[PDB]
Ligand binder design. Structure first.
Ligand SMILES: *[C@@H]1O[C@H](CO)[C@@H](O[C@@H]2O[C@H](CO)[C@@H](O[C@@H]3O[C@H](CO[C@H]4O[C@H](CO[C@H]5O[C@H](CO)[C@@H](O)[C@H](O)[C@@H]5O)[C@@H](O)[C@H](O[C@H]5O[C@H](CO)[C@@H](O)[C@H](O)[C@@H]5O)[C@@H]4O)[C@@H](O)[C@H](O[C@H]4O[C@H](CO)[C@@H](O)[C@H](O)[C@@H]4O)[C@@H]3O)[C@H](O)[C@H]2NC(C)=O)[C@H](O)[C@H]1NC(C)=O
Ligand SMILES: *[C@@H]1O[C@H](CO)[C@@H](O[C@@H]2O[C@H](CO)[C@@H](O)[C@H](O)[C@H]2NC(C)=O)[C@H](O)[C@H]1NC(C)=O
Lengths: 229, 214, 142
């Protein structure tokens, strides 16, 4: 029953602005606090913000104070995050999350239904926000040409694409045995690079042909490259 | 701003065992103002614990946590298969609320030394004016592994990039790549290129290398 | 008439958030075991609420004995700003005096202070006088 749907993602340049929305359903929305949590590349969860049921009390992580503004619309059962002065380091997946349905004052009195954001029992599937000044580009694909353990190894190096993600398949996608696709790495240039590899019998190299299928939706690109010894 | 330091950074356990987590707080939380979360790759995090050890909705009695002052621990009496994932502590005693950096619980297997391969820059990429050397470390365990690049046996730095894959879904092993990026002008000027691998499973370090053009 | 009678009975919050011409205002309310406060709702004509500093308002007579007892007296002579109960009493006593009925007896259900506060509005007798209130006022002809 309980679900949280985020929206508003996309690519924005440094200094730009962006607006996120989170729709709650299946419970009495007006009673609950809400918060936002993000995960940068290779980082853990980082507390960004939280607001109570009517948005009257809003507070922020030290690292986001000033640039971020939280709001909510109890009339149409929406909560928002207005993000201004976005910077590259703010690049991350952002999750909307439901807080508590009670709170406690300095006197120890518990207030049922006046929710706040101490912790989060319901989390959205998350929406990606990428903050970078790099222009959408399709990858350059370079072959990685070949032994240890009695076999050879090969792969495609998908380099200088932007932004994430890409998807790789082999022979349309029927070849899964032995394929490792590595996590993308952000290069000094701010562009991504990764390698895709697959282990095969050294003897089967000459007989059969190997092509790697690179997909890069941001630029609606698709690139195959045959690997020759 | 409350800083949370967790330990260990990750755990190597086996189904049926008990797991004990650790989260150190910089300043004093009131024991009951602590939460713990669970997160598997590819899924949203799920709340496990609030109020120190009040069970969150849907969380079985098999999970328990506690602690006080500046150290708090979580204990899982008997791990099951679905329990291998990343776990985060969370304090809400003082704004800004902050999370620990996470501790990963992974599938334990037998020790596996790495299979080591080196790939030279292809002629294509060079022709385009860049030069990339790839080192592949295949099917090894444990995760800890040091990869060092050497040019004419001289150690490089700041011009290489690593990357480890997710734990293998079939054999519970890892794979890792190390990528050395060089300019074309310098590449043609030098001879020896080497990938050095140090790992728990090797009796001593293994070096793969080639001389440019051979 | 030679003698009239009047009966009185009257019954008389902190923070009220007010929204959306009527008021959909919501606020904390107390029930259960001295701690847990379920946040309830109600309604309120703008006349019934007072402003004070977002937008949060609160409740605006003040004393309930004179509320009722004033409805007693004034319920006697066949007759039926807010910040002073005392005045509205001297008002009621003005009407009744202006009809000729001298207050007979008045019963009341810091007592000495309160009575003397009434006797000042009625100019009656101390030996005549003595949260919810039910109060009675008897009118005599002079
Ligand atoms: C049901 O009952 C509940 C009862 O709680 C009620 O909900 C409460 O509603 C009120 C008003 O809507 C909320 O009060 C808000 O609190 C805001 C939080 O501010 C915090 O941060 C301040 C800054 O922190 C600095 O200092 C600390 C010091 O330790 C430091 O660490 C920080 O790093 C930072 O440097 C802090 O000063 C502030 O302290 C206030 O709160 C305590 C609480 O007891 C009080 O005792 C203090 O005297 C002090 O007032 C707090 O910790 C606060 O920002 C906000 O205040 C105003 O902010 C701007 C300033 O211009 C105003 O424009 C704005 O309009 C606000 O009025 C506000 O007062 C309160 O938080 C709710 N309850 C909870 C638990 O959050 C419901 O409304 C009731 N009704 C219903 C229907 O449920
Ligand atoms: C008067 O207030 C109540 C709550 O104080 C409002 O009730 C909400 O109605 C919406 C309908 O869209 C529900 O989604 C909310 O869950 C209700 N809240 C609660 C606490 O039940 C009511 O809508 C207000 N008056 C009007 C005309 O809407």
């Amino acid at each position: 029953e309980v679900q949280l749907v985020e929206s508003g993602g996309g690519l924005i340049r440094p200094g730009g602005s962006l607006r996120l929305s989170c729709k709650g359903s299946g419970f009495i929305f007006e009673n609950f606090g809400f918060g936002w949590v993000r995960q940068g590349p290779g980082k853990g969860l980082e507390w960004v913000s939280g607001t109570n049921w009517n948005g009257g009390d809003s507070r922020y992580g030290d690292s986001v104070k000033g640039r971020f503004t939280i709001s909510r619309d109890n009339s149409n059962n929406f909560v928002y995050l207005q993000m201004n002065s976005l910077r590259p380091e703010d690049t991350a997946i952002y999750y909307c999350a439901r807080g508590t349905d009670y709170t406690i004052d300095d006197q120890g009195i518990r207030y049922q239904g006046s929710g706040t954001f101490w912790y989060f029992d319901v989390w959205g599937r998350g929406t990606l926000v990428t903050v970078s000044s790099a222009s959408t580009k399709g990858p350059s694909v370079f072959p990685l040409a070949p032994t240890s353990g009695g076999t050879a190894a090969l792969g495609c190096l998908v380099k200088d694409y932007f932004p994430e993600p890409v998807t790789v398949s082999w022979n349309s996608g029927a070849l899964t045995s032995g394929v490792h696709t590595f996590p993308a790495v952000l290069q000094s240039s701010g562009l991504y690079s990764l390698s895709s590899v697959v282990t095969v019998p050294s003897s089967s190299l000459g007989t059969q042909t190997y092509i790697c299928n690179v997909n890069h939706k941001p630029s609606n690109t698709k690139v195959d490259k045959k690997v020759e010894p | 701003e409350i800083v949370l330091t967790q330990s260990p950074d990750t755990l190597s356990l086996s189904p049926g065992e008990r797991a004990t987590l650790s989260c150190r707080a910089s300043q004093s939380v009131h024991s009951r103002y602590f939460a713990w979360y669970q997160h598997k790759p590819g899924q949203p995090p799920r709340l496990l614990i609030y109020g120190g050890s009040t069970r969150a909705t849907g969380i079985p009695n098999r999970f328990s946590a506690g602690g006080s002052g500046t150290q708090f621990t979580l204990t899982v009496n008997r791990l099951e298969a679905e329990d291998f994932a990343v776990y985060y502590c969370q304090q809400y005693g003082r704004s800004p609320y902050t999370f620990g950096q996470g501790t990963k619980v992974e599938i334990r297997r037998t020790v596996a030394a790495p299979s080591v391969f080196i790939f030279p820059p292809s002629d294509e990429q060079l022709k385009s004016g860049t030069a990339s050397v790839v080192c592949l470390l295949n099917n090894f365990y444990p995760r800890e592994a040091k990869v060092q690049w050497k040019v004419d046996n001289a150690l490089q730095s700041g011009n290489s990039q690593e990357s480890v894959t997710e734990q293998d879904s079939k054999d519970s092993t890892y794979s890792l790549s190390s990528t050395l990026t060089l300019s074309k002008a310098d590449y043609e000027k030098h001879k020896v290129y080497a990938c050095e691998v140090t790992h728990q499973g090797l009796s001593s370090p293994v070096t793969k290398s080639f001389n440019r053009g051979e | 008439s030679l003698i009239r009678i009047g009966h009185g009975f009257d019954v008389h919050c902190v923070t009220l958030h007010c929204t959306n011409e009527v008021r959909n205002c919501s606020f904390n309310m107390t029930t259960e075991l001295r701690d847990k406060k379920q946040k309830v709702h109600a309604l309120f004509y703008k006349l019934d609420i007072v402003p004070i500093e977002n937008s949060k308002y609160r409740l605006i007579g003040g004393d309930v004995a004179l509320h009722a007892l004033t409805d007693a007296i004034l319920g006697a002579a066949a007759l039926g700003k807010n910040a002073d109960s005392r005045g509205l009493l001297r008002e009621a006593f003005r009407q009744v005096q202006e009809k000729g009925y001298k207050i007979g007896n008045v019963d009341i259900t810091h007592i000495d202070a309160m009575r003397a506060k009434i006797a000042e509005d009625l100019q009656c007798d101390i030996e005549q006088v003595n949260i919810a209130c039910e109060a009675v006022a008897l009118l005599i002809r002079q």
